Design a protein around this ligand. Structure first.
Ligand code: QH8
Length: 289
């Protein structure tokens, strides 16, 4: 009990500093301490009850600064603190956690599209590079299942991608997996039960409402019910056996919609609205502040 869905940063006209937390048990939203630096295209994650904001970019009227930052938010104090910075700026990043360690995957620095990957050790407050992906990927979806790290879709600088790959930590090695049925850049990627879900994204022509899942045992991708809204650059997380998607861009509006997927009924429902429409957020779940 007592866990909230935290959304950090995002974009609407410029990069945002908002930290806001949604309580699925009562429908309430709380506005919490702003990020020290506004950022869109970041990712969020939680280790040891602390919320981490990783990478992104501050797009403002006066600048476009890609972020190498790792910042940690403690719900017990409602305060952000800087942590060690990554080796390189990573906008449009994906992140995953294995065994208490944060993996930062891909992303962009100016016109550079990274294949590099690095791993953070909270105990030592240190990052170290690991093996790079087989593909350069920005707008890459990342998730962890069974202590394996997956990088899904994205954009390599020339093409949006349906390909996906998996990192095996004990071998420090990446291998391709079955590609998705749909090209997806800027999708929401998460894990639920024994599958990696890829929701939404941009296929090079349109923002998508379709959703597909990779069963790690059978190595197949299967479509599930589509979202109500087409969305790219959405936030995503899992809480109490359901997927939550937050915001994004539908080709017309920066959405405030939050939809929730129930795998037992294979249905999506609209559960709340953010306080304002935005894309490019980082999202994670931890205790209320
Ligand atoms: C263009 C204007 C359309 C409306 C719009 C949408 C979103 C934002 S964002 O600030 O959230 N952002 C903007 C940024 O960093 O370029 C952002 C963050 C994460 C992923 C992505 N993403 N997803 C799909 C694709 C794609 O093209 O394949 C991309 C781009 C190539 C990286 C974008 C701002 C404005």
């Amino acid at each position: 009990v007592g866990r909230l869905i935290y959304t950090a940063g995002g974009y609407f006209r410029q990069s945002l500093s908002y930290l806001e937390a949604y309580n699925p048990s009562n429908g309430s939203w709380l506005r919490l301490a702003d990020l020290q630096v506004p950022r869109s295209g970041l990712a969020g994650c939680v280790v040891g009850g602390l919320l981490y904001a990783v990478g992104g970019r501050n797009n403002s009227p006066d600048g476009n600064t890609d972020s190498s930052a790792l910042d940690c938010y403690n719900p017990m104090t409602n305060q952000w603190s800087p942590c060690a910075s990554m080796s390189v700026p990573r906008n449009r990043i994906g992140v995953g956690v294995i065994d208490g360690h944060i993996y930062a995957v891909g992303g962009s620095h100016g016109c550079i599209h990274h294949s590099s990957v690095e791993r953070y050790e909270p105990e030592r407050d240190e990052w170290h590079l690991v093996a790079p992906m087989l593909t350069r990927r920005i707008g890459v979806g990342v998730a962890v299942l069974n202590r394996l790290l997956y990088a899904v879709g994205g954009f390599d600088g020339t093409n949006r991608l349906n390909s996906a790959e998996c990192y095996y930590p004990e071998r420090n090695e990446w291998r391709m997996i079955t590609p998705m049925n749909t090209i997806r850049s800027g999708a929401g990627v998460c894990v639920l039960h024994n599958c990696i879900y890829a929701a939404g994204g941009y296929d090079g022509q349109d923002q998508l409402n379709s959703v597909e899942r990779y069963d790690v045992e059978t190595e197949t991708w299967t479509f599930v019910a589509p979202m109500r809204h087409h969305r790219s650059a959405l936030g995503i997380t899992v809480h109490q056996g359901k997927i939550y998607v937050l915001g994004g861009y539908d080709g017309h509006t920066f959405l405030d919609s939050v939809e929730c997927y129930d795998p037992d009924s294979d249905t999506w429902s609209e559960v709340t609205r953010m306080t304002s429409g935005r894309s490019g957020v980082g999202v994670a779940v931890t205790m209320e502040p």
